[PDB]
Design a protein around this ligand. Structure first.
Ligand SMILES: [Cl-]
Ligand SMILES: [Zn+2]
Length: 258
């Protein structure tokens, strides 16, 4: 595809192939903590990843995805703002060219070093491809990464990246437990939004955790050693694969806390 993260095909250009890029429910957004409103209707998140079955990790040319067997009916996100049950299909990250940027969501304009997205689809639509065509099709759990102590549960991910350095490379990645990527608190903000890469479909209930996970400088530096390009082609480090905050328009960000 033509789209990427370059000066001539990056986020500012996506609207030409995907006009929904200038839509009413685009993601990510800045979360203004002044105005985000606490909503007591909001239930605790239920994240059930004990039966989550990871399969493989793939460099797709703009990030790396860890893919799951989404036939596992117990590997589910539910509760919080959601009706029904959502199955984990993949996770990936967004990160920067340095520690001071990389997240897609911001909090009072603050950018984090990276952001993790755990992507789930609504079982009522049968599969992912059908779910993304519906406003309540996906639930994406977003988790900020900041630099400090190391996150032990991330280490298997960062250590495998050397073997998937270029576009198209993959590695077996079984027995990875995504519970090791979760912070202590499941306090969250939620709002209706979109995929943050093309096709940018407005099909996502976003659930963004308030508490970042801490990862070490070295862990996040390994992300930046990946390449956008395929093998044999001219080296281009995979960095700044984040879409900037988009207009909130007529949406309300709700907080599950305070
Ligand atoms: Cl490391
Ligand atoms: Zn993402």
């Amino acid at each position: 595809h033509h789209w990427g993260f370059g000066k001539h095909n990056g986020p500012e250009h996506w609207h030409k192939d995907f006009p929904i890029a200038k839509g009413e429910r685009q993601s990510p957004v800045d979360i203004d903590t002044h105005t985000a409103k606490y909503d007591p209707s909001l239930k605790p998140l239920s994240v059930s990843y004990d039966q989550a079955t990871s399969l493989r990790i793939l460099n797709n040319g703009h990030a790396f995805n860890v893919e799951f067997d989404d036939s596992q009916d117990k590997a589910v996100l539910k509760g919080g703002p959601l009706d029904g049950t959502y199955r984990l299909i993949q996770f990936h990250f967004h990160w920067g060219s340095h520690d001071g940027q990389g997240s897609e969501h911001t909090v009072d304009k603050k950018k984090y070093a990276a952001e993790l997205h755990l992507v789930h689809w609504n079982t009522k639509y049968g599969d992912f491809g059908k779910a993304v065509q519906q406003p309540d099709g996906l639930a994406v759990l977003g988790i900020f990464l900041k630099v400090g102590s190391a996150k032990p549960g991330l280490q298997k991910v960062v250590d495998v990246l050397d073997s998937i350095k270029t576009k198209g490379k993959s590695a077996d990645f079984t027995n990875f437990d995504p519970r090791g990527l979760l912070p202590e608190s499941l306090d969250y903000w939620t709002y209706p939004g979109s995929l943050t890469t093309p096709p940018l479909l407005e099909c996502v209930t976003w659930i963004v955790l308030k508490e970042p996970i801490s990862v070490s400088s070295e862990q996040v530096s390994k992300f930046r050693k990946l390449n956008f390009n395929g093998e044999g082609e001219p080296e281009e480090p995979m960095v700044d694969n984040w879409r900037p905050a988009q207009p909130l328009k007529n949406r309300q960000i709700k907080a599950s806390f305070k």
